[PDB]
Structure 1
Amino acid sequence: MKTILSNQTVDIPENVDITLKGRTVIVKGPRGTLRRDFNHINVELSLLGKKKKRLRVDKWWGNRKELATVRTICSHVQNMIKGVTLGFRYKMRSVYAHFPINVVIQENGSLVEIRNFLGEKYIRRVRMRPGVACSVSQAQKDELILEGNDIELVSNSAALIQQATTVKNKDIRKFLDGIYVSEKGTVQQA
């Protein structure tokens, strides 16, 4: 069964200005500008709301497996607004038993250096995606803070270092060592 129509409206706040180039939305607010194409998803992005108030996505004569693509665009846009108004802040804490995990950033972010994981000599280096500002925190002992605007860029950089600190040939039920994402938050809370 093809469904005749499904849609959903995004409530754009007053800080931001969204302006769509056909199917590629660009989103600029206080912190910066973000962009994301959607020339794979085949929907109608309307900007019906005036002065600027609604990004409305249609789908159209689509069936089950494409009607699902309606909201996933809707969310990819609010995440874009929530990233340019407040900005994402992923926190990750270092966990270990004996050997202290020794983090130090090296350019501004862009190089997270990890010594002494499980006592290993091999020093692990981890790039960051562009626009992600990694930083060693304060008001906590073993804790990094990854900031930026793109949820996509920030959270995979978090995974890049969460997946770099993995144990081999052990029972990871016992050896609970590594740097784990502890809190997916925001920069400003409002």
Structure 2
Amino acid sequence: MKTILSNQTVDIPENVEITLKGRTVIVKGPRGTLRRDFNHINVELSLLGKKKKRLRVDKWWGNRKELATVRTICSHVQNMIKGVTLGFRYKMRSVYAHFPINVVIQENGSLVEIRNFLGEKYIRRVRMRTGVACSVSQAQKDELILEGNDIELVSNSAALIQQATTVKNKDIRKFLDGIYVSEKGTVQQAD
């Protein structure tokens, strides 16, 4: 019905600095930096306040389908702040009912080599997206920790790893085997 104004405010901590040359948002924090182009949203972004620096997102004369993106923008900024402050760590555990899945890292966790998945001789090589590092965690059996900054990259690499081990021509209910993302959290705690 062409709503007049739709505004959403996002708070910013003291650790991270955020900047905008336009719809482009750049967040600089303790662990690396993030930058995203929002040229396909068509929404106003303005930071205001000293020592607080709250970011408001404003939409004027938007329909029911256009008023939805003003919250997705704030959610993306929240995810960027969370990843640049604490980071995103996905623990993926592998179910290996009979055949043990042998996962190894190739080059600084940028490449995952999976051997002996359901007894197949095929070697599955999955490369991680830039900025995501994977490792075999200790004090636990058959798990992989994938740590990074950008959530849309960490979860993308996790989904790639999960879909690499997929049963074919067999039952999906039966033959429960493969690496599934068990836990999702941050690298830094107490926040």
TM-score calculated relative to the size of structure 1: 0.98
SS, match of residue 155 in structure 2: helix
Distance 1:49 1:72 in 2: 23
Measure how far apart 1:49 and its partner are.
Answer: 2.4
Residue of structure 1 equivalent to 2:145:
145
Structure 2 unaligned blocks of 5 or more: none
Distance 1:83 1:21 in 2: 21
Measure how far apart 1:51 and its partner are.
Answer: 3.2
Give CA deviations for 1:105-162 in whole Å, capped at 9, x if unaligned.
Answer: 0000111010000000001000000000111111111100000100011000000010
- Structure with the largest fraction of strand: 2
Measure how far apart 1:22 and its partner are.
Answer: 1.1
Measure how far apart 1:172 and its partner are.
Answer: 1.1
Pairing 1:186–2:186 present: yes
Aligned length: 190
Contact 2:11 2:52 in 1 (8 A): no
SS, match of residue 144 in structure 2: strand
Contact 1:28 1:84 in 2 (8 A): yes
Contact 1:110 1:132 in 2 (8 A): yes
Contact 1:3 1:60 in 2 (8 A): yes
Give CA deviations for 1:57-86 in whole Å, capped at 9, x if unaligned.
Answer: 001111100100000000000100000000
Residue of structure 2 equivalent to 1:7:
7
Structure 1 unaligned blocks of 5 or more: none
Distance 2:102 2:175 in 1: 17
Distance 1:60 1:109 in 2: 45
Q: Which moved more, 1:11-20 or 1:48-57?
A: 48-57
Give CA deviations for 1:155-177 in whole Å, capped at 9, x if unaligned.
Answer: 00000010000000111101110
Distance 2:23 2:183 in 1: 33
Contact 1:17 1:52 in 2 (8 A): no
SS, match of residue 137 in structure 1: coil
